[PDB]
Design an enzyme around this catalytic site. Sequence first.
Site, short mmCIF file in Angstrom:
data_model
loop_
_atom_site.label_atom_id
_atom_site.label_comp_id
_atom_site.label_asym_id
_atom_site.label_seq_id
_atom_site.Cartn_x
_atom_site.Cartn_y
_atom_site.Cartn_z
N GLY A 195 10.91 4.08 0.32
CA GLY A 195 10.79 2.65 0.57
C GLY A 195 9.42 2.10 0.22
N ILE A 242 0.82 -1.21 0.00
CA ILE A 242 0.00 0.00 0.00
C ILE A 242 0.86 1.26 0.00
CG2 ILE A 242 -1.97 -1.13 1.07
CD1 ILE A 242 -1.04 0.01 3.74
N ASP A 245 5.11 19.06 9.34
CA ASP A 245 4.95 18.15 8.20
C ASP A 245 3.46 17.89 7.97
OD1 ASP A 245 5.18 16.33 6.16
OD2 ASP A 245 6.42 14.90 7.27
N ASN A 272 -0.63 13.42 5.01
CA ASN A 272 -0.15 13.01 6.32
C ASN A 272 -1.26 12.89 7.34
OD1 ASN A 272 2.46 12.93 5.34
ND2 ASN A 272 3.00 14.97 6.10
N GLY A 290 7.81 4.48 -3.27
CA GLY A 290 8.54 5.72 -3.39
C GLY A 290 10.03 5.48 -3.22
N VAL A 334 5.47 0.34 2.14
CA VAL A 334 4.63 0.08 3.29
C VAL A 334 3.76 -1.13 2.98
CG1 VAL A 334 2.58 0.88 4.52
CG2 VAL A 334 4.59 2.36 4.35
#
Lengths: 277, 729, 155, 89, 104, 82
Positions: A19, A13, A134, A139, A16, A21
């Site tokens: 890494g 899911i 952030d 997010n 990038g 997920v």
Amino acid sequence: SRYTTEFHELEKIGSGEFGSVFKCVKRLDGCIYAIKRSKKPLAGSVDEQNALREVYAHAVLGQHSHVVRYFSAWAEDDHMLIQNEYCNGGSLADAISENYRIMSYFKEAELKDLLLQVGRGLRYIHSMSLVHMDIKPSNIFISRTSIPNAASEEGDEDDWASNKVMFKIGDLGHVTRISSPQVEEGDSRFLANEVLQENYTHLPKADIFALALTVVCAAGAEPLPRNGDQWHEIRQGRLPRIPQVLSQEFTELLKVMIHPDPERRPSAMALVKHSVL
Amino acid sequence: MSLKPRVVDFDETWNKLLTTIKAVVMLEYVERATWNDRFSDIYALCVAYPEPLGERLYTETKIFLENHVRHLHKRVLESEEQVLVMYHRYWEEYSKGADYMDCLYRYLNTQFIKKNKEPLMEIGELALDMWRKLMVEPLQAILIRMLLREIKNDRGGEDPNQKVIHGVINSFVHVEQYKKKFPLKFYQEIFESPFLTETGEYYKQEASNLLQESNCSQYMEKVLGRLKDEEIRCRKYLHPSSYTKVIHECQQRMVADHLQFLHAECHNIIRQEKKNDMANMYVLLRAVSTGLPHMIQELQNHIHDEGLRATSNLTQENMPTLFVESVLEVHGKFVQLINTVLNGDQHFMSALDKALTSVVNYREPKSVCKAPELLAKYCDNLLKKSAKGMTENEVEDRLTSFITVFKYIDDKDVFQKFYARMLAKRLIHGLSMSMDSEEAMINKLKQACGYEFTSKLHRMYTDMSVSADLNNKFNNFIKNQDTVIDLGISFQIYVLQAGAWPLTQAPSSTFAIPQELEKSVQMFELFYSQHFSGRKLTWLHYLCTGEVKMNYLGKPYVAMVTTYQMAVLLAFNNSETVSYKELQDSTQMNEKELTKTIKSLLDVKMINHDSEKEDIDAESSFSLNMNFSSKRTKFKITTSMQKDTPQEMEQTRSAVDEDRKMYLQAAIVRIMKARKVLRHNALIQEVISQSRARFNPSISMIKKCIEVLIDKQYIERSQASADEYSYVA
Amino acid sequence: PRPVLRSVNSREPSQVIFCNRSPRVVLPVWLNFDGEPQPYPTLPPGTGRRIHSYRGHLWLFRDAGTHDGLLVNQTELFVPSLNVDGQPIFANITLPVYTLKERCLQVVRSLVKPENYRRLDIVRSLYEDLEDHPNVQKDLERLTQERIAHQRMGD
Amino acid sequence: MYVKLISSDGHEFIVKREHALTSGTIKAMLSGPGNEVNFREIPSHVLSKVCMYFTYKVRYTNSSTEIPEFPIAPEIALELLMAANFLDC
Amino acid sequence: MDVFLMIRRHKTTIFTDAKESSTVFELKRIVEGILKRPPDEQRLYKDDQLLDDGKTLGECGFTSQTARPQAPATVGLAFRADDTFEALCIEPFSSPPELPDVMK
Amino acid sequence: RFEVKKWNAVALWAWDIVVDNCAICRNHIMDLCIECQANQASATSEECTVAWGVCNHAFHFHCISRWLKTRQVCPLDNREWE
């Protein structure tokens, strides 16, 4: 490795340069969790202090309702893996995209709820001398709850909807202490003017300012400008055009959150204790 | 007696079931009790504890059905000359018997065969399969043959038993009921293949003899009758899926084979306006693929010849009226005949229109087409006010009928210019009979062609529409001035657009305004400057029609006069002594036109000439006629300007050609604007298609205007090797 | 090579309110973009649930205990539609009308151990019917059959 | 129009014809020349439930209202299956 | 709504449906349509209670929830073979067989 | 003796523009221009647009504006046109 012996992948899911997920299930109890897999950050590279800031943020914050929970982390086989709770709802970036695909827009009560959870989360985070730095629609994560209801099949039949949607703040990589400011260059779309000039005295107000921009984007506005005249226009206390009409009091709240002076923007403590929500 | 499995002997139950099945197949009478009982025996024999006996029952039923089919086939084959009726009678009972015994055999078919499905088929399908295997095919070589002769005799006039024949034919279709891949292929192969060839061969022989014995006119009716008879015979005997096919097989043998013989008569059919044979000839050639174009071409040629001969010898007097009426009556007479007899086929309407387009636009090899000018004269005669004028609604109906002929004009630019000229000449002198008739006639052109055709005429009318209000405003403004006296002058000036209005002054000769009406100018320009911002007005002295003369006298006489005659008359009357040359050039210029007007006035016999010569000289003297008498106190002097000149028509044609140049150049520039790359033949075809609606331009003039545009540098050509036309902005 | 019963990805929201009317406990299943079903939590009888699903996804509704088929909107297969004027799509679940054999087969299956079918005194040729238990795949194949049947009868 | 089913015990049930023609066999057993029928294999307890099933199936077919489940007693659930196979109901 | 009930007498059993609005005389007409008997001789008993024409089916006790199609309500009928009425007599169906060994 | 009782006259109307035939715009000064008559768009039926020039030379607004855009000099006098 412990990941292959104890965890079972369910679905990929994320992707990038950072890494990946994966959705995982642990044999010991069977509850569904999420695993973030990445490489070792280089020495003297931005990802390194991002990772250490994130791990210190989890260590200090502990556990809370509005912050995604950290469970464990480890590095092995040239890979670094971290373990967090599985928010099944998704990110506002995907929700707004799928909602716009049909030219549909969020309800105003849902916007008020957005404000409620985000304000409470920012209040709790800033209680510990921290600023998120952030904040963006990618997010902010969603979690679902279900409640059954009863309807009489024979004769009269009326059904009512009552479900609760939970919102959480995550991705604590950029979090820096207000007493020890280490600010990483934020996204140009939601970057406050004070951060642009490296004015490191009014950090908590920058996240409040970006919060209103996130809410406006969730309302159905066009994609935010990355630079230039429109960038400066938005940063000058001007809000973009909205496809739908909204209440004037909420619009005043948006404007005061997008006020130029950082002090004149209300803090999270005032926002949470407001009858408007 | 439990439903649970037990042990039962096969022999007794099998014998009883076989007896019941035989009784059912015989269509005999069987009691309700045994019918109730046999189903329980069937259920007992189907499921069992030791072993089921469904396979044995299926084999025994197959054997019994095979024996029955063999017995029936032997019995029907034993009887000769009566095979068809015996076959039909046996099938009529066998179908019902098979249906009933299949209804009895529902448990075995429903459970055993469908579960299992040495192919296995249901009992109802097995009976028909055995019937077609051992009762139909071995007898096929006879069954079809005699059958077809019972059809052939129907052509003779004797109709055999229809029921038996129909049942025998339907048996082949009913056998293949259960087949799903090809339910009608067996019947087709057994019936249609030989029968179609036989009937096609018989119809060719019949048609040959019928054509040899009778003439073409009787041939046509007899062919129609044979087709009608076959259309009924196919329904009476043949299957509904073949009704068309055999009909086709007739129409390709009795009509298509003699097509040339028909075509060689076609001419003589339709040059005599025969309403009887033509109506059947067209109907029979509709079926034929290629019989229609000959009809279209011959009828078009006949229409063109009739239209050409209809206007060849018409009288010169009242030229446009007869030309319009003959075309209208020819068009009506032909369209009504085509719609009545020929059922209104669109191709014939197209051919009629094509012939009429060439008939109307007939042109002599060396002369110029006279259609637009004649139609303009017709419109002028109908629209001009006269003592013998007719009612307005009749005029409107005449214009509505005339628009049909107007639609056939190949080039409407010349007609448009002539209409503009005549309408201007009519409205300047107020010769229109109704103000609304002009709008009614203009609306017809607007709907026929479009806005661009009659925008000039719309603004033409708008000029005089606003002129009356302008004159009223000027009259109101006159009283505003504190001290202004107009004396006797009271005039209306028609404000007209220079470009839109076609009239103009080809010779530019300045004129001296008489002093008695000098203020009439100045007050008008000052009023116009006050009312309008910056419009500049130019006076046209060629069309002034102000009547002026003394009214108080012992012998009064008042005449319509022109300003050119007005000036010379004022100069002559002001001086008590006549002057020959100094007055004429001191008071006015353009001496040739002044002398022409003086000669016209002498022809009116208003002033006597002392030169005693028919030609006016510079030294010629004049004298006012003291004894001038007129039959009418008020009259109008007929000036020579009212009559046109063929030279003016020449300049009108030149102006039309110049407008054609301008329109062609604009269209060409637009065509380069559409696409950068243009092929030579493609460009020519596109130009012809684009400009065809308004008129028909010639290739040479198109090339000339293209070269003119080349001179304007808007078009660039690289090399005369590959035809390419590039465009430059 | 994708099965005809496949769904289509559209990211298109839809609000569907599942209502249970059958006394037996229902169990929804969704056909994925590959062609295989995925279950979901059961709905207690007489209860409703408003849920969010994407348009074009194929829904079936089986039984929790016996897996016998159930009809949704008087149809074997259900597919949502775009919401109009803010009214959720209704997808009722109702019991079918079993023929006397299957309705009598369910009780026998409930009351008899699956290993003891051979023991009961019954007609020998019929335990072949009782031995088979309902499964989703056979129903899916039978449902795909009428697709080609319809395309055959359309020409 | 009323048809009459006869039981092995001796009981006679009288129902509407259209109700009875639901089963395939009982329709077939009247398709040909062979109104009244006669079953000498079916007891009374099976048939007094088969008739109720006929009524239930005819009444509650293609209906908007909720369809209640058919209560089959567990004692007769074995003799009511051979009857459903035989009758092709 | 309506009721779905049967009429039983000795060996005979008839199925029918009715509206609770209607009265008993309508059921008498319905049953004499088959029995070909005058309505006066027919006498309807529910359990052990006499039924009269004037009363409607709603009054007797038959309701929509009482008699579903899968559970019809039993109604007894009595005739009059002579000047005197004959008492009711209805026999029950065959006793079900005992539950087998495995099915326990 | 001759005298005047009532007069009549016919006069056209034009503009105060010194031009021969508007060779640059290729149209009459008071007639519709190429662009207006080719685009077939909405415009005034008699006078679409007339823009008077300061230098006593004026063309149609559309074509003169296009010419000014492609070249600032006035075609007639090689000067500035307003």
